[PDB]
């Protein structure tokens, strides 16, 4: 059976703890891996990412929404609220 352990042992997904995170570079989304060359007021503003001419990413987040817990995963659109309300 090809499952999560198969993904881990194939060298495409790896576990990192809090102390290892000190020494890695992480991208929020796969779209951040490739630098683009728009002008829509409806969407949010992504970080400029202009401190370095080029970025050498070592890992990419599976999905940012996974940083929440079980209780917070029930809130619809938690990014549109004040944190004390959450």
């Amino acid at each position: 059976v090809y499952g999560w352990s198969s993904l881990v042992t194939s060298g495409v997904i790896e576990y990192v703890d809090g102390e290892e995170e000190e020494t890695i570079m992480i991208a929020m989304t796969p779209e951040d891996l490739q630098t683009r060359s728009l002008n829509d007021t409806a969407k949010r503003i992504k970080p400029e990412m202009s401190t370095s001419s080029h970025h050498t990413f070592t890992h990419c987040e599976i999905h940012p929404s996974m940083i929440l817990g079980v209780a917070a995963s029930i809130i619809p659109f938690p990014d549109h609220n004040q944190s004390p309300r959450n």
């Binding site: 000190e22 929020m28 969407k43 949010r44 992504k46 401190t51 990014d79 549109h80 004390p84």
Partner: protein, 97 residues
């Protein structure tokens, strides 16, 4: 936002990044929605505010209780003076008027 990691607020930023987005500036509004870094920074600020309120209310309650215990037995008499339970005069006239 302090550098919780090694010279960076989050692992997604390079070392020594003093740009506004790197240290906790939320360009987007609540209507637009917050990026994950902005969401985390907002959560940090909210938690700090909750802790500060929770300690401030207790400190104020203790101060108020002590103040009430201090001035419990002060009463204005019929001659206009303000005396304690022992009869000692605190003010010769309440509020000087």
């Amino acid at each position: 936002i302090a550098f919780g990691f090694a010279d960076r607020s989050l692992p997604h930023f390079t070392k020594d990044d003093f740009s506004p987005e790197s240290k906790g500036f939320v360009e987007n509004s609540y209507l637009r929605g917050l990026t994950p870094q902005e969401f985390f920074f907002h959560a940090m600020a909210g938690r700090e505010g909750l802790i500060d309120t929770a300690v401030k209310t207790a400190e104020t309650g203790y101060i108020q209780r002590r103040l009430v215990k201090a001035l419990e037995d002060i009463m204005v008499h019929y001659d206009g003076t303000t005396r304690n339970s022992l009869g000692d005069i605190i003010q010769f006239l309440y509020g000087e008027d």
